[PDB]
Amino acid sequence: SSGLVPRGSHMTEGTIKTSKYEIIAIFREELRKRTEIEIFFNNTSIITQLTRVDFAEFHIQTHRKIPSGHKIRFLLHSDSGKIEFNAALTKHDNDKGIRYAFSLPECLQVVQRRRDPRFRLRHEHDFYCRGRHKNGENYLFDIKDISDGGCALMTKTPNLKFLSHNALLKNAVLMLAEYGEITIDLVVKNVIVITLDNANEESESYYQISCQFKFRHLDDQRRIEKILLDLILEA
Ligand SMILES: Nc1nc2c(ncn2[C@@H]2O[C@@H]3COP(=O)(O)O[C@H]4[C@@H](O)[C@H](n5cnc6c(=O)[nH]c(N)nc65)O[C@@H]4COP(=O)(O)O[C@H]3[C@H]2O)c(=O)[nH]1
Ligand SMILES: Nc1nc2c(ncn2[C@@H]2O[C@@H]3COP(=O)(O)O[C@H]4[C@@H](O)[C@H](n5cnc6c(=O)[nH]c(N)nc65)O[C@@H]4COP(=O)(O)O[C@H]3[C@H]2O)c(=O)[nH]1
């Protein structure tokens, strides 16, 4: 839409990686960046991180007991996109954490559909979105992340009746601290339940509202582009 495409996170609708070397280098970078990994089986997902990686296996550490028999599904929350694969269990021993070892996958799939990178607002930044629903009821949301094309809003107290898919939040106001305020339409793309971590070992539940910007004027888009560049370069 704008042409601006910073390096990192090139789009792919689905790229298959199969080289044992690259698969290892990828696991090593995501263990280091402490990337979130998500583990799915029998209709639910654990969520952990990697503990070590070598040339035949990767290792996690979870209080839950993971099954055995066949390969189970994984999803890495990588800055390159969602990295998915299947891996089988090979070792487990008995903080009462069960050490776990999985064979490295033979192939990974990378999917990166985001045309604009998303900046995650850290506790150094306190941005909000306020507005009025169609019935005049007021709302105020924390902004979790923001990109040239939209944002994710966090709240414990959504009014779900105004948050169906593609519902419009008309004349929301982004409150971006030193950057001022911008009035904007938001199209609701998704609503999920999320567990970020509060301070500090305590994990807490939030609703996450994924939104697309519908700009009022072309200059509002350019203004957001300048804010994101500032955010990225100053952190
Ligand atoms: N309709 C819609 N929903 C959105 C969008 N962005 C986030 N969500 C919802 O928010 C969930 C969490 O997103 P995430 O924390 O960034 O965590 C994501 C993210 O880390 C990653 N991921 C998935 N797809 C992509 C992608 O196309 N690009 C990138 N860079 N990462 C992706 O895998 C994790 C899980 O993905 P999901 O299972 O799909 O789960 C997503 C998804 O349900 C969006 O642009 N449109
Ligand atoms: N900062 C931020 N912006 C958001 C969020 N959700 C939506 N947007 C903005 O709204 C645009 C369109 O969302 P979409 O229709 O669901 O269309 C999305 C969606 O279908 C898909 N996608 C991207 N990431 C994910 C993901 O993590 N999970 C899933 N299930 N789909 C994703 O790729 C399409 C386009 O991605 P985008 O180019 O990034 O384009 C996004 C993005 O600019 C959000 O949680 N945070």
Numbering used by the authors: -9 to 84, 88 to 228
Excerpt from the paper describing this PDB structure:
Here, we determine the crystal structure of MrkH/c-di-GMP complex at 2.3 Å resolution. The binding of c-di-GMP to MrkH is very similar to Pp4397 - both MrkH and Pp4397 hold tightly two mutually intercalated c-di-GMP molecules, while VCA0042 combines with only one c-di-GMP. Through structure analysis we find that MrkH mainly forms H-bond with two c-di-GMP molecules. The side chains of R107 and R111 also contribute a cation–π interaction with the guanine group of C2E2 and C2E1 respectively. Besides the interactions between protein and ligands, two c-di-GMP molecules are also stabilized by strong base stacking interaction between mutually intercalated guanine groups. R111A mutant almost completely loses the c-di-GMP binding affinity, indicating that R111 is the most important residue for c-di-GMP binding. However, MrkH116-end loses the c-di-GMP binding affinity, which indicates that the connecting loop between two β-barrels is crucial for c-di-GMP binding. A highly positive charged hump consisting of six basic residues (R125, K127, K154, K163, K207 and R209) is identified. Given all these data, we think MrkH has two separate DNA-binding regions, with a smaller one on N-terminal domain and a larger one on PilZ domain. Crystal packing analysis helps us to identify the MrkH dimer in which makes two separated regions merge into a long region suitable for DNA binding.
